Amino acid sequence: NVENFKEDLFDVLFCYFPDLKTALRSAITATPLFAEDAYSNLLDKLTASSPVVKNDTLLTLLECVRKFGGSSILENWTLLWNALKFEIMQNYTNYDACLKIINLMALQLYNFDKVSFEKFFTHVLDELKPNFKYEKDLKQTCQILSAIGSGNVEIFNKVISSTFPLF
Amino acid sequence: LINTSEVAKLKLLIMNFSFFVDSYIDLFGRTSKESLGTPVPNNKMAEYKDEIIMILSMALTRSSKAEVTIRTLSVIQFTKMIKMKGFLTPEEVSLIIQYFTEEILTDNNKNIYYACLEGLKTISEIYEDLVFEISLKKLLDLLPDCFEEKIRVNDEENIHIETILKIILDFTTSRHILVKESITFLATKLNRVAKISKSREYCFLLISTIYSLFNNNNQNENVLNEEDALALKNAIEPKLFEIITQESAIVSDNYNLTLLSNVLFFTNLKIPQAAHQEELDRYNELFISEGKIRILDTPNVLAISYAKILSALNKNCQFPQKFTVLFGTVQLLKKHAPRMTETEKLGYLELLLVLSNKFVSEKDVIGLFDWKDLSVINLEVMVWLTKGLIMQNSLESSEIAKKFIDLLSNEEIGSLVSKLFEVFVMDISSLKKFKGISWNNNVKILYKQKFFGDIFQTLVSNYKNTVDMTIKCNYLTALSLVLKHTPSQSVGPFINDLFPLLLQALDMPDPEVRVSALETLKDTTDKHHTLITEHVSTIVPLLLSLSLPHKYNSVSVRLIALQLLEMITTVVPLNYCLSYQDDVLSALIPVLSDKKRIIRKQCVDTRQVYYELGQI
Amino acid sequence: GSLVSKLFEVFVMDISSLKKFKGISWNNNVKILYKQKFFGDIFQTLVSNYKNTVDMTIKCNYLTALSLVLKHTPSQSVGPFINDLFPLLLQALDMPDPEVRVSALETLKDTTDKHHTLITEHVSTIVPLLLSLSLPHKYNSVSVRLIALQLLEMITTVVPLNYCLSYQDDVLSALIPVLSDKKRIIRKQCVDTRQVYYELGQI
């Protein structure tokens, strides 16, 4: 019955939030009841200029997506992937962390439901197809597709078959 | 300690005695609820209590009103007397309450007013019963039976009607019994004045004060207990249904009805979970099944209040009659659409939103979809159902809105739908995620950002591939009306694609769109710099023209345009800035000569900044 | 008294037909410094009469006359009279005219920008008044609320930390119905004020 006391424990942890940071990461990803609020805050810290808090927020988001089941990510994937693409285009550093973010997003979406993962993949392909058609930012799109297809055999086969005919 | 009439000697006496009061506090202690019966053994201060009380009263009373400092010191010392333990008897504190009430009523000087307010708050938090008995009851008694009467506080002084209401608003902000009695008395007075008199301003003021009392105390979740809230509701509800059912003078006005509905929602918010089902059944019986009022048979404004009634009940409740009432209200709304007024239509649409977002499942909602008939009222119903669906952040909604975009391609329906697209994101004054309680509704925090992310890409893609300016204008209006309500700091990924459309949005009838776009581009120039440098040649003339007065340029729009001129001056390199110096100074002369005052100061600052940049 | 006090605003007012245009100078006889000189000749008598009155009707009439004179005068042209007018300025924040309120806010803005003591003793009354002004009202315009929030910013900046900590919780508690208003700029300003007041607590 923690839902009755929800939103009371969020404030003190976010007040304590920015060397010994793993405890906060573990606590903030304890239960899925964090998720629907956690992103709402963490995404804001994605706008911070200092790269240290950016890396910390990337690690927190990794711990979040890793242990928030499948429904919360299936709901927040559009906004989270939009933010990750924005920070990719802007650019254990941040780059490898966010590439692993995308990879684990794809893996979780595939593990939860096949139809939702297929919709994710086809939306990503439709939005990133002009990059292949044009000659703009080929490396970033290729790396993003590599992260997406680096989850399992089926996802790899899907991305390969849907990517090679393009180029 | 010698009585005197000189202001300086009295002031020095007060300052000197202000240390002896602290000495007495340190020796014994401070007042407490548990220590209200045990007295101090003995002291020589008690023998001097009469003299110090008498001299303090002379300092406060029978004294020239020009010496505000003496009165402020006197009331501060009286509060310090209230603080110290075991010094003042109940009669003395009652008399002090009387002096404070007389001072706050007769005089309107801000310093003495706030000092008396602080003293009254301290007395209330130490003695709530006495301050309720002497102060609150009198303040409630001053207000008259008829609007705009002659209030006789004393022989000569008369006080305004709004002053007493403001006084009631100020204190009792955290006192349970005081605010409960104030709410009960205000409800009784409103009911009586509406029954015996036909006035609008007085009833509106009373209902606004009641709404303020509920709002200022529901924000702490500790002023009113559950059983106390239930008792207050049992006391207030029949006396509000009496005015609601009768014609009175509040039904004819939409604002008064909306405020009373908000008050009903607030008073139904704090209910123990054991009584939600019975109250829901009683409301269903009273509003639909039985009674003279039939919202599902004859259109009326009253239905809107029912919506505010439903928004307070628990989400996971047994609601057997959900599909039937949904079909009935949909059929009535469709049938009587040409004849119903805007108020009743808005009420029925809010009811539809509440039903869609609270009880009925997504399957029934999508079953009630009909895209074949392109009637305006069907568009209203469809949009207001899909808004409630988006509030739930359902998976199907992200697809349904897409159809709307296709429906925007219509010729005779594109303009109306584009104008109405703003409904998707909009505050309702009844449905937010209140801190603490979380079962009131199903609204999600991140619905706005997700909706904007799913919508903006398709909107910009369609806008960039259109030839006739009608469809382009419709798409731009849709995107802008979505943008004006979404949080500003929540659009970072889409800035690059939205920047040309952001610039295009600066020609719009709605001032809200203009101010939102101005703030968004302020954030852009705060965080990005290349876009501003490349687009300055078009941004500067647009901002310069926006500063001029217009039927759509509000004061906020002009002020934010001047602030954006500040930012673009700061960010853009000097070489480009020198190219746009003479024109800005020439065209800003008719800006600091406008009607408003803050705009004049901002224009003066901008002129000074631009002039100083030239020499440096 | 009441009608004349209300009509007193006519003495200083823009006409848009009699102005000192650059170039031509024979159009009229208006002088540049008439406003400041008139305010100087009027304020002393007005404050002397207001401070020596018992019935609040005549006091209100005097205050209305002074406020209507002040609203049209430039805010940077009143330096000598700040010390005497500060209590009158504070009394002026209860007026039907939003222009009077915005002019008083601008004047006390200049005061707290230049002075630092008067704010120090009068903070205990200024802070609740600004907090109450931010709430929506039939006379509180958007400019009045925005300038009130800005004045909250600068009174937070100027007043020492010890006094500021005494007024932290109340400001945060009472600003909740402020960032939920209809307007957008007011929401941003309230968010910034909440952030500043929160950040001062830890530092």
Numbering used by the authors:
A (entry chain F): 208 to 225, 242 to 314, 338 to 413
B (entry chain E): 414 to 1029
C (entry chain B): 827 to 1029
From the paper:
Here we report cryo-EM structures of the HEAT-repeat protein Met18 from Saccharomyces cerevisiae, a key component of the CIA targeting complex (CTC) that identifies cytosolic and nuclear client proteins and delivers a mature iron-sulfur cluster. Met18 is a 118 kDa alpha solenoid protein comprised entirely of HEAT (Huntingtin, elongation factor 3 (EF3) repeats, protein phosphatase 1A, and the yeast kinase TOR1) repeats. ScMet18 has a curved S-shaped structure comprised of 23 HEAT-repeat (HR) units; each HR contains two α-helices that are connected by loops. We find that in the absence of other CTC proteins, Met18 adopts tetrameric and hexameric states.
